[PDB]
Ligand binder design. Structure first.
Ligand SMILES: Nc1ncnc2c1ncn2[C@@H]1O[C@H](COP(=O)(O)O)[C@@H](O)[C@H]1O
Ligand SMILES: [Mg+2]
Length: 311
């Protein structure tokens, strides 16, 4: 393989959209289109915000590389519509896509299938926030991470360092998601991500934020968040975590395009935070880095991802 690019037929690269991440998507999608055309594949841009989606079927596209991020592009909406119209697509199906955006149900699944994840409690809108805060501190201690359960709240993740500050953080979070996750903070180790692309053996990435945690500032503002390969871990642990990461993805119904995000504690135990079924494909994005670390260039990576829509 050695795939005749003819075998891919007429291919759409879905890019743009209407979400808050239209920008990263335009960037990723134009690169992906080039990567596929560099391989001689009959690929075309298709922006579903600006083109009628039925044209995919009507113009005879057979498959799509999904370079959308956020809203309908990532949550199962456009995956369902594509299944409905008979168009094959990269990444996960409806269930994996929707379950991967729902941290509450992701973490339940993981707990029942032995995928490690930070101990947690939930808080619902209309709860007695002061009373829940007491019970939660008593169980989990401080610090804690307070996060929306579900897609796509407007209240950023908050690290709560003191018991007295918990009730306000709960009440605010619950104003914007009916379900709030409250996680034990995993301290004393480091942060990592496992990119998954087919059966490619991709290295782990250590993520080193310059401040408290991988916050909006660290991801989108800061010039100095580190994304490190080698990740620092010993070979047996790195292999072990990559294996767990792939099971974490599989048990949610996700198929093998994405990244699995995890923390390590001081003892070196892992705790998975989320999967991401729509990772970036810009020139500074993590899957191309991890792939180039093992000798797989950008066009080769996009062809490998697309190849799984065959058969
Ligand atoms: N339970 C946790 N323990 C430690 N760090 C966390 C935890 N939850 C979230 N974080 C941090 O906050 C970031 C954003 O959280 P989230 O999008 O939920 O993953 C993560 O990438 C970590 O840097
Ligand atoms: Mg996102």
């Amino acid at each position: 393989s050695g795939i005749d690019p003819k075998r891919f037929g007429k291919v759409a690269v879905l890019l743009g959209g209407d979400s808050a991440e239209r920008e990263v998507s335009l960037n990723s999608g134009r690169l992906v289109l080039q990567g596929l055309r560099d391989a001689g594949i009959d690929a075309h841009p298709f922006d579903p915000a600006q083109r009628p989606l039925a044209a995919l079927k009507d113009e005879g596209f057979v498959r799509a590389f999904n370079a959308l991020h956020g809203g309908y592009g990532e949550n199962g909406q456009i995956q369902g519509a594509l299944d409905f119209y008979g168009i094959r697509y990269t990444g996960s199906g409806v269930l994996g896509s929707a379950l991967g955006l729902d941290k509450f149900r992701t973490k339940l699944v993981w707990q029942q299938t032995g995928i490690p994840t930070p101990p947690f409690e939930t808080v619902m809108r209309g709860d007695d926030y002061a009373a829940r805060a007491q019970d939660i501190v008593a169980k989990l201690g401080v610090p804690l991470f307070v996060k929306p359960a579900s897609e796509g709240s407007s209240v950023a993740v908050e690290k709560v360092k003191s018991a007295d500050a918990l009730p306000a953080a709960l009440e605010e979070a619950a104003k914007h998601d009916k379900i709030v996750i409250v996680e034990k903070s995993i301290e004393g180790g480091g942060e990592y991500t496992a990119c998954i692309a087919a059966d490619l053996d991709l290295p782990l990435i250590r993520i080193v934020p310059a401040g408290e945690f991988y916050d909006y500032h660290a991801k989108y503002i800061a010039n100095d968040t580190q994304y490190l390969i080698p990740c620092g871990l010993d070979a047996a642990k790195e292999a072990e975590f990559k294996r767990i990461a792939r099971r974490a993805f599989d048990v949610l119904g996700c198929t093998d395009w994405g990244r699995a995000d995890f923390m390590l504690d001081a003892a070196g135990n892992p705790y998975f935070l989320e999967v991401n079924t729509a990772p970036g494909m810009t020139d500074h994005s993590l899957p191309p880095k991890a792939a180039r670390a093992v000798g797989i260039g950008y066009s080769e990576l996009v062809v490998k991802v697309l190849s799984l829509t065959l058969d």
